[PDB]
Amino acid sequence: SEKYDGEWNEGRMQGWGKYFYADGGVYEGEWVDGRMHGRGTYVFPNGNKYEGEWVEDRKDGYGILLYTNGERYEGYWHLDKAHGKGTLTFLQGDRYVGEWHYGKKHGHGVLSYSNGDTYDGEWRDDDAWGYGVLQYANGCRYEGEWAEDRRHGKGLLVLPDGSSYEGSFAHGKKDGPGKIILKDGSMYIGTWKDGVIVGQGEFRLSENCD
Amino acid sequence: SEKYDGEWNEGRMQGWGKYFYADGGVYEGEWVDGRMHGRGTYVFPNGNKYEGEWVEDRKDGYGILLYTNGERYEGYWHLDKAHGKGTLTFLQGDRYVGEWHYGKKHGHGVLSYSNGDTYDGEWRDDDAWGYGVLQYANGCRYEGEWAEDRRHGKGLLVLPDGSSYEGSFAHGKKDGPGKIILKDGSMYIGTWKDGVIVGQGEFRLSENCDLS
């Protein structure tokens, strides 16, 4: 009573009710055995707002959280964190659609950046990890391996003009053995370090004129 | 005396006269001191014909020789051989216009092949020798050194698509140190043997949307 305006059952909050927390936060929604449980709205004193499902005072099931910072999560929650399928939109216009593991981008997901870049592929612990495709705004496309949100392992870099690089990347740059095919179809097989050709390599003219 | 129907001076053939040689050849033309000398026509028993200038029984000055085999020389002669400027046309349609040294293509000369190919440059002893340009029919152009009628020394090979090779040739083929530009600007510096790249070399990307 006073701090809780709602229904009771066996001396515990149960049914619909409003609760005013000491820090200025307000819940209005379903209660089970004295906890937020079922559908309910939580307006936080920091400006955040949740509308969705609750289990034992935690966000659990379907819910929408509008963040102060302009971010908006719409999808599934487990133990008070993003879990399963969910969409995160940012104020700038960036959008993530895909899999979540206790509050982190994890599994397969598509992140459409407002800058025009799109990443379609694998995530671990909020970073690009595994195989994924980045379609850059300028026409460049990387299809290959990622580690700690950077291109790392074997990958294909197709340029707008038709040029490609097939080979190794390390810490985001061409690094190790690789091959470039040029506009005219001729190919160079050689070695990169920190994104630049080092030493010498094999050059083979295309069979389309010589 | 009956072999010659023409004029005399100091008991020697001089002025205009006809002569019938034992082998069936016939000269009609100018005579000086009992020799073919000045303007005259010689029909040879092998079918060849000369019309032009003579000095002491030799083709010397301007003259046309039509050969049985279909070749035609038109130009200058010295001591009975092509010498100075002269045009040789062949049955096939091939044409040489340029310099001659005692019967050989020698100095500067243009050979227009019926193929469409043109060679403009230097000759020694009937072969391309020194600097010359071959404008091929297909658009390719070689500008560089020749030896024994084949590309040999340093040369530039520009392809129709803008690709070029700058470097060494031996016996007609890319051979030794050289460099390719691909027109997109990208360049390979390496080594050739018998017209093919051998081993490895230096590759430098051009400023296309590939180093950016």
Residue numbers in the entry:
A (entry chain CCC): 143 to 352
B (entry chain AAA): 143 to 354
Passage from the reporting paper:
High-resolution crystal structures and biophysical analyses of a truncated form of the TbMORN1 protein and its homologues from the parasites Toxoplasma gondii (TgMORN1) and Plasmodium falciparum (PfMORN1) enabled, for the first time, a structure-based definition of the MORN repeat. All three structures are antiparallel dimers joined via their C-termini, and, when possessed of the correct key residues, can adopt extended or V-shaped quaternary structures. The crystal structures confirmed that each 23-amino acid MORN repeat is composed of a β-hairpin followed by a 6-residue loop that connects to the next MORN repeat. The structural studies presented here make a case that one conserved function of MORN repeats is in homotypic interactions and possibly also in higher-order assembly.
The structures of TgMORN1(7–15) and both P21 and C2 crystal forms of TbMORN1(7–15) were subsequently determined to 2.90, 2.35 and 2.53 Å resolution, respectively, with the PfMORN1(7–15) structure used as a search model for the molecular replacement. In contrast to the other two proteins, the P21 crystal structure of TbMORN1(7–15) displays a bend of approximately 30° among the sub-units. Superimposing the TbMORN1(7–15) P21 subunit with the structures of the TgMORN1(7–15) and PfMORN1(7–15) subunits over 202 Cα atoms yielded rmsd values of 1.0 and 1.1 Å, respectively, revealing high structural similarity between the three proteins. Calculations of gain in solvation free energy (ΔiG) upon dimer formation for TbMORN1(7–15) C2 and P21 performed with the PDBePISA package yielded values of -20.1 kcal/mol and -11.3 kcal/mol, respectively, with corresponding p-values of interface specificity 0.01 and 0.08. ΔiG values lower than -10 to -15 kcal/mol and p-values lower than 0.5 are significant for stable protein dimers, indicating highly specific dimerisation interfaces. In the P21 crystal structure, the position of the loop differs from that in the C2 dimer and keeps the Cα atoms of Cys351 and Cys282 at a distance of 11.7 Å, preventing disulphide bond formation. Analysis of the interaction and electrostatic maps of TbMORN1(7–15) and its mutagenised variants clearly showed that Arg293 and Lys316, residing in repeats 13 and 14 respectively, are crucial for maintaining TbMORN1 in a stable dimeric state through electrostatic interactions.
